Subunit: 448 residues, 4 copies
């Protein structure tokens, strides 16, 4: 069991964010310290800062009926050690549900179930996690101020409820803050225009009456757009929905066994060793495994609904739920006296008008939010560097004549270009957590 | 094209009922008269009497999302002649939907779609079908009244809208009236106790508010009980449902290829030729193909919903939707001042109380309604016979010294004991229709 | 790690057989003694006697391509404790194969793979397992010979290689010897007539040339008969095969979720508590889950091969591989001067002749071989008892005035009538092993 | 029924090739002339020239177990008219196999079965098909030699058995000759290097002994390469096989419903109307539907075999069957005194040596063989044209002042760039055949 470190003490590690990636590190550290699992093994002074009030995993996209797109074996522990108490199967055993899960004959739990698994995991680390704390900046520190050597970092976080800044000092920092909502530059700001990440949380507040005949539009062609589009038909039974996509069709995610091997934990070494050109070419060739793609079973379900509409009415323009392929939004009118916005559409090749009460935007995420937190440490990078360069062990490159060997900053979840498509996913977290514990607490736990 | 016969004329054939079975005969006759399909081929004087106001197929069980449990190839024509204009594939071509159906990659259309196919078929016979006519009795006739030989039949039908009796005379009669709702003898009569056959038609009238937290019970363990039970959770989102069954579990329908061969049109010969003991033993050994069984995909779907309830709440007694296996109803209290009935339950081996607003009873059908229509012709059977004995060609056995060779009565859909499990189904209708046309219009069309 | 007990010492436990059932006990004991898994925990003196020269699992039926009919989660440890080092997933991790297994997206490993898993398990108990030892009898013993109280058992085993009898004394005995080959009484003894259990081991010796056009017959309609029949077509490409069954068709195994719940470890309590009549009726109602049934995917594969034969030749009598349903063997001629036997066939209802080089008999197993080993202890049963009566904890009932409380005999794998259909299977072994350790070593390990 | 035209007579139509594409035209013409199907309808003088001795469909790739990659509904007639006697379902009915096919529950017949269907179709046109005739050139003709107007074409064909040239004159020509084997330019000519199209025909002649331990290599990553690679393991049980591909993995064919709509017969209009840039971009975006892709079920099967090899031996270099991704052939040594060639390999990014008895090359086809047959008619194209420009109705553009309106040349199966990915496939053949009959025999059959 991990014990709390007083705020005023110098930490060994401070992690920013407590989502899956950070939780995987916490679990890996527990396991590395467990004399039952690690026969070799003073507790390291560790703390996790999370802006949410309690543990949650993409709560705004927890659509009813939504399933995991990954095998349960690729949970937070199994691929590193199946004997771990933090496995999904052990979770089910602790819940009295293992025999019942077995009878489902599925590798893909509901997202709701997998979130509770991770919640059950996270709760066992409550003593070392500070919730309601949003990190605003990371600042370099010098134990000897008159020297020119940085040997610690001050991490400042704002309390979400109360608003005051708190400071914690640490030798090492991990940033695992996921991504920020990516919005098209052409779209204007409006409370009726909502990103996919806030679908379950903000949309019901805007459209209070669930029986009212609303017009709701969805922009995108990926898993989130398909999930939202399909869900709206259940959540708002009398609403007219529209899916808008640049591509000609919803295209299936590629989970075929040979292609799927790029997500193997050991393939991170092979991917990282490749040159920039070889890494850029590889990500593009395997784009159908993660980006702008939908699980085949969802596509088929949607297509079936589209076919039943055809049975009832051969006239496509009369359909309650429609898909408009090869379209882009030219302009949005949202200053009119009516409840609805006017969306203007044209061909996406190098058209109609829609009037809608709400526009759901499922255009993915940006993984650049760490830049804002690390502006004050940019000068510690090697001369001329304008991007953070993560090593194989995820430790960012810094000038060794400016930064002590005991001090470092690690990045997690934003290292796709260097580590592969599995970097932002749950695929390698169990193994990566294990690697991270070794990279950070290596020398400290070698003597045991 | 088949033309109408004036009511006052002597018919060659009169069919009672215009459901799938009778429709299959009509289609087979059209095809036998089509010089394009039948190279050998005065039109026979034919009329169909149907009690419904227009063509419908189990409308009270047309659950949204419900699928066919039979391959579309086993439609009303294909197995007899794929070149027929009455095939499901030709229907889709006429509707502009064939390419769209192909992309679904399914042999199992929605029940809604298949009903429209049969509707599209039936509408082409509107000139020879009298809707809104319920047959009340079949009476024997003698062209020479002083003789002791029956050579025609008078069929009397009551108009459902207006109530008056009409009489039509014919040499030959087909009875294809399906089955009547089978209700348990222990259950009392109550408007809150409804048979599965009236689920979509009468239940919404009883429970007007779709958002109200009702308690609704379902009795049975077959396809209809599972379909109703699963549907209620969608149709009444806030209702507490209960499935009550005598058996320990929902058991899957057997559609495995070798076992499924009993439904082959040619296997009717082999089944019919078997003795009474061999026929009784065969039906029991293949009971899992049709009776008290559910499509595996529906069972799995229901089980998944049951599992998600377990994820949210480990306490089974708190669940919104529950299944109570190995239970029987001992008594029903329905005279109380409250809106709900009290259902008392005990073990089905040789318990609780439920309070419900509605009880859905899915206990199948009886195939004995033809007996009431043929009471006045019973004396034409061979001496000592107290059951109607259908030949291989479905023509009931009558005393040849009392009934002329040109006169006869045929039975359809109630001949399971003699013809097999496929008799009540859509399995052999295309071929059976063809056989029926030959049996009835054989000598009349042999000269062509 | 479990250490060896000298032959001459009084044992706490002696297990007869080292198949899955006994291996599950060994694993459960290791786990109960592991202070990492069991926080409470002198080693108990234990020994396993196995007649085979090394660990094997139905080697004569290890057909190439054959799969497990059970989810890998129902391995030898997971359902009791997923943290165990003896889980299938931990096995794959130790073999460097876990990521590769995950990509298969299957719960059903090849029988070859699962056997190696169990081999990998068994090898860790080599110090407490005596291979090449066939138990011939269990004899009661009295530490005080002049008393009338039995407090130990002598177990005598014959060395298979050398032939001499060895004696080991123990307070408690487990008999987990599986089943003996069940052969029809009408069939005569012949080297060309081989039981399914010796298919992979004895048949290749009889039919040495794999390219020779043999006639090979298979008797049965279950999983083993289907597996052998399908395999012969690959193993002997030029041979004429024949499947002979009493039933009209191959019928599928029922693995539907609600019915499958009878295999739950907790349902053993509910099944055991039921009366003899309720237990007899329950086994018969769920017969399609284990007995005379074939995995649907195998049936479909076989049917497809049968269909391709029809494409090439419409004449069924000319087919290389044929299925003869509703047939029984009346007599077998095997004294003729030719290489082939003559099998005479008739209808199985209350016919042809086959000439074959080999007859494979897949008619299941008997679970009564323990009777022969326990004849000398029969007099210790309560007066009038002529069958062994196993308690819930599998300990057979004995007269408490004749047998001390520290002495007992346990049965495993033959308790279907009292414990359910899962008794002979791998379904509950993990949990049953755990229960067995508690029943046997309860008082001995309570002080820890 | 279509009757033969004497060789010396002027034909209305002459078709080059009698594969699926030409067969579809023949069937469409039969149907357009059938007064049963076409209510409006002297027979047109038509002849088909085919170089094979009898009807065959990719005989060199008729791998045992190989399935169709297209739904049977997309046969040679159904999508145009389901009432046609040339439908796959009618074929099965004529063969007595329709009920048996239904029980398979598959849209994908074996390639062997579908070939026999097309054979059964083709045989009904034997009177208008000249087999054993290879067309060597098409020459323009002038009924008035002194004029400057071409109004007919002479088609010259060489008899394959006897070698002499025959000439047939026609107003209109269709070229439906499929594609020629595409071979990499770096590979030298050798009898041990065989294209996929000659796998079933020439490889068994080269490797006579099926039990001999050969080394066999397969170059490619598409359906044919996967099929050959998987088949070799069955056909040569003791051989060491190697799959060589430039890509990192076998990638699955995309048959998802929305993407699959590009293969719709009506989408040919939409595709054709698009500009050259829009057509080039569309083919590339949907490349995963036809090119360098494998049916998912085959990939999974291959992967499973690869996994079983891992179970038996963790050492990948020791495996009997191996896949070498991201490799290209640099040089081939084939002049050595040994039976085997030496294949040198390097990385395909911008290595080992293999010694093999045979190299199977599955690198697709070229669709440019029509160019050689039309060299003498090139001058009839509009000035400056160096490529044949097919109209929507497939009629190539010619100078209207040089070619009469009654004379024309049509292309089939090579029009991908203008008509879409379905052009070379079986997808639109039924409809295209119908369109072709109208384009060619339009004015001739309008008066009926
Ligand atoms: C709808 C949806 C479904 C998905 N399903 C799958 C799937 O099936 N399989 C799969 O492999 N991947 C899936 N993913 C991908 C997903 O990114 C990963 O599963 C996972 O969320 C990665 O975890 P993370 O910790 O890197 O990022 P996150 O899960 O986003 O966690 C980051 C955490 O940091 C916190 N944080 C952010 N900023 C600050 C700050 N300034 N201060 C303090 N804390 C902060 C956030 O509150 C958050 O809790 C899915 C993504 C979405 C959107
Ligand atoms: C919910 C449900 C789903 C089913 N799905 C399938 C399936 O997937 N596949 C399958 O093979 N089978 C299925 N069946 C079985 C079904 O019985 C047959 O498909 C089919 O209905 C048989 O047709 P029929 O004409 O014999 O009987 P019916 O369809 O019942 O037709 C009888 C007709 O006679 C009329 N009639 C009755 N009495 C009189 C009277 N006195 N005078 C005049 N007219 C009268 C009725 O109005 C009715 O129209 C299903 C049954 C149910 C209840
Ligand atoms: C082909 C086949 C496939 C199967 N597949 C499955 C499956 O997928 N899933 C499933 O749940 N079940 C399956 N089973 C059922 C099977 O019975 C169990 O999986 C398992 O074998 C039960 O283990 P056991 O120890 O009870 O019996 P066994 O496995 O038979 O082990 C008994 C052991 O005792 C030894 N022995 C016997 N007599 C003596 C003696 N006199 N002295 C000393 N030693 C002796 C034997 O050599 C043997 O090693 C299958 C059975 C067969 C035949
Ligand atoms: C292994 C394989 C599997 C396939 N499976 C599918 C599938 O599942 N679905 C699908 O849609 N497509 C499939 N195809 C694509 C295939 O191209 C089409 O199915 C089909 O063959 C197209 O017919 P065609 O007439 O255009 O060409 P072809 O089938 O090649 O027919 C051309 C004919 O012209 C003849 N010919 C050639 N030159 C001359 C000459 N000089 N004189 C006279 N005659 C000549 C040839 O002998 C041949 O018979 C497959 C292709 C291959 C190689
Ligand atoms: N969208 C998440 C992709 C998961 C990946 N196919 C994997 O198996 O790891
Ligand atoms: N419930 C209808 C059964 C249909 C049958 N399996 C058939 O294929 O004909
Ligand atoms: N033939 C073995 C049956 C296994 C059983 N269905 C189970 O899941 O335990
Ligand atoms: N490889 C042939 C592709 C067939 C295509 N998916 C179709 O449905 O027409």
């Amino acid at each position: 069991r991990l014990r709390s470190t007083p705020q005023d003490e110098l930490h060994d590690l401070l992690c920013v964010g407590f989502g899956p990636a950070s939780l995987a590190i916490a679990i890996a550290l527990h396991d590395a310290l467990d004399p039952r699992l690690n026969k070799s093994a003073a507790q390291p002074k560790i703390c996790f800062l999370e802006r949410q009030k309690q543990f949650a995993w993409h709560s705004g996209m927890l659509v009813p009926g939504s399933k995991m797109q990954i095998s349960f074996i690729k949970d937070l522990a199994t691929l590193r050690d199946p004997r771990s108490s933090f496995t999904f199967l052990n979770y089910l055993h602790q819940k009295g549900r293992l025999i019942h899960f077995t009878n489902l004959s599925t590798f893909l739990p509901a997202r709701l179930e997998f979130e509770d698994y991770m919640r059950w995991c996270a709760q066992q680390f409550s003593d070392v996690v500070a919730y309601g704390e949003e990190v605003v900046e990371v600042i370099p520190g010098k134990s000897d101020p008159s020297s020119s050597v940085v040997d610690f970092f001050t991490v400042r976080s704002r309390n979400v409820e109360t608003g005051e800044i708190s400071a914690r000092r640490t030798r090492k920092v991990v940033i695992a803050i996921g991504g920020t909502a990516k919005m098209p530059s052409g779209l204007p700001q409006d409370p009726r225009i909502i990103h996919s990440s806030k679908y379950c949380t903000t949309l019901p507040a805007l459209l209070k009456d669930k029986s009212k005949p609303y017009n709701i539009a969805v922009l995108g062609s990926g898993q989130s757009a398909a999930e939202i589009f399909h869900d709206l038909q259940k959540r708002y039974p009398n609403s007219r929905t529209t899916l808008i996509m640049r591509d000609s069709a919803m295209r299936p995610s590629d989970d075929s066994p040979f292609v799927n091997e790029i997500f193997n934990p050991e393939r991170v070494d092979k991917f990282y060793s490749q040159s920039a050109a070889e890494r850029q070419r590889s990500l593009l060739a395997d784009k159908a495994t993660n980006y702008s793609v939908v699980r085949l079973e969802l596509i088929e379900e949607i297509y079936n609904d589209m076919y039943l509409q055809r049975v009832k009415n051969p006239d496509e323009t009369q359909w309650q739920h429609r898909i408009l392929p090869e379209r882009k939004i030219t302009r949005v009118e949202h200053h009119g006296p009516q409840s609805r916005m006017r969306i203007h559409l044209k061909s996406s090749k190098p058209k109609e008008t829609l009037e809608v009460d709400a526009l759901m935007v499922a255009t993915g995420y940006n993984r650049n939010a760490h830049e804002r937190l690390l502006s004050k440490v940019q000068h510690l990078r090697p001369t001329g560097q304008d991007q953070w360069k993560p090593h194989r062990d995820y430790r960012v490159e810094m000038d060794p004549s400016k930064v002590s060997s005991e001090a470092g900053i690690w990045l997690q979840g934003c290292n796709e270009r260097t580590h592969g498509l599995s970097d932002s996913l749950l695929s390698v977290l169990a193994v990566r957590g294990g690697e991270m514990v070794q990279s950070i607490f290596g020398e400290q736990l070698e003597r045991a």
